[PDB]
Design a protein around this ligand. Structure first.
Ligand SMILES: [Ca+2]
Ligand SMILES: [Ca+2]
Ligand SMILES: [Ca+2]
Ligand SMILES: [Ca+2]
Lengths: 296, 296
């Protein structure tokens, strides 16, 4: 079954996309700081909450990229954090949720970005990477091949986007440089390069221009099949005020979504957003999925 | 039996290397001040601890060279010291650990340096050298032959690297001069030369560059079967923490490990490191063993 109306099933939108196309080329909705949805204290919320619904909701709304920040415990486990804040979620919980979704929707893949967010607990004998790789990554749900990863190889599996140093097991997208608060271009592996727009902590107007600038580059470069474009629409908190990630997203999400809706581009990139919800109308993740109609 | 995968064991990694290869040609992880793992006092650890796990752990993580420093006691026994610090370990204990490992893994060899670390306890009978050679070295676990020692003669035995004066018994590698805090080249016996890099007490940048320079040379001189390369990654203590052996090691170990990973050399030498452990993230000892692929 390969038809344009199939992009409309948000829990199965990758089904009609040809198996031979690189993940890089697909336009894919992502969630920024995916595991922050359990946070309750409004002071903790205004500073570090980026999502209000759990992993399965994010996935059934079309998100296929997950921004997972981890801290290594004294127990050979990894739990999720946002800066110093313990989220109330462990890495194993994320992986179980992803496995359950992939079992229900085996046409899909889940891309998991994994970053060391906070310093290791004092009793930990292993490194963040040996501990992840020995205790979690060994599961056959994780794709262990590399190059310019294709959709066909990814279906039914989790594809790692490594953001931690010292990996010793092949698989997914290699760790690459990653300067703070910039738009940058580098190499991922022999077959892949990457441009990332990740200017968190600029003012609203610079943010919106940066999102659009990088989106223009990816539209104008729609046939560059081994070039990843990762575009974060999320902006960090001004704290106590009218400048929370929530407040920014309530304007940024529908603005970028309308731009896409109106331009009807053939490629928009991996667009990683705060607050996936059905609240603000032109829906960003929907418009992003719809930019794949030229691949069917 | 006979493939490069057998380098992954690492209780048995010497097994696939041909017997007629001189030990000098093999790339071999060693541990610096091997006996210091029992130290508990924080002041003492800061100044004098270089390892945190026992001898068998070291061997089971691939170390085959051991830096033993001893002191002759009241009872004509040799106990291990780090300068004035009594460690809580004797020569007999190291030798018995080595025997058990070699019984369990008879394809391997253990190379042991012995040095006089502190003056004899005044109550003691002869000299350090005469007590060692008469009470310990006479055991047939110690190889008594010399020249450019081959792996085939070394298997199932201890190969001594003599760092004491006054030797009266043949076997292993002769004492040779050894200028302080320098990298230098000399002769060991009629059949072997040595380059040693042992700049303890130099700034971090000069240390990292000295390590690489010596390693660059050894990887360029891969067919030089006549020539031993001993490269110490260890740096001495500043009063610490923040300039501990542990502190320096946390950065040096993974940095050199990654340098080797990236360069894929066919020879890197006898690499003697602080803190053999699983704490930091690409593993120095593993990357040195892996550099033996060309020999198989
Ligand atoms: Ca984060
Ligand atoms: Ca390209
Ligand atoms: Ca010593
Ligand atoms: Ca030579």
């Amino acid at each position: 079954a390969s038809s344009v109306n199939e992009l409309e099933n948000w829990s199965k939108w990758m089904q009609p996309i040809p198996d031979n196309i690189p993940l890089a080329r697909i336009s894919i909705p992502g969630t920024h700081d995916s595991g922050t949805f359990k946070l309750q204290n409004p002071i903790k919320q205004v500073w570090g909450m980026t999502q209000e619904y759990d992993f399965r909701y994010q996935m059934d709304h079309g998100a296929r990229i997950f921004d997972i920040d981890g801290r290594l415990t004294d127990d050979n486990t990894i739990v999720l954090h946002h800066g110093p804040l313990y989220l109330y979620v462990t890495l194993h919980e994320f992986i179980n949720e992803a496995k359950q979704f992939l079992k229900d929707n085996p046409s899909e893949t889940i891309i998991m970005s994994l970053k060391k967010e906070y310093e290791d607990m004092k009793g930990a004998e292993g490194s963040f990477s040996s501990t992840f790789e020995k205790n979690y990554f060994v599961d056959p749900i994780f794709l262990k091949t590399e190059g310019n990863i294709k959709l066909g190889d990814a279906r039914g599996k989790i594809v790692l986007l490594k953001r931690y140093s010292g990996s010793n097991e092949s698989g997914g997208y290699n760790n690459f440089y990653w300067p703070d608060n910039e738009t940058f271009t580098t190499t991922v592996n022999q077959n892949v390069n990457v441009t990332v727009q990740d200017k968190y902590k600029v003012n609203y107007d610079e943010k919106v221009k940066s999102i659009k600038d990088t989106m223009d580059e990816t539209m104008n470069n729609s046939e560059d099949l081994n070039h990843l474009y990762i575009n974060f629409t999320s902006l960090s908190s001004g704290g106590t005020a009218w400048n929370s990630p929530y407040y920014y997203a309530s304007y940024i999400n529908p603005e970028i979504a309308n731009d896409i809706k109106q331009k009807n581009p053939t490629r928009v990139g991996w667009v990683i957003q705060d607050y996936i919800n059905e609240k603000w109308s032109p829906l960003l993740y929907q418009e992003v999925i719809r930019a794949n109609k030229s691949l069917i």
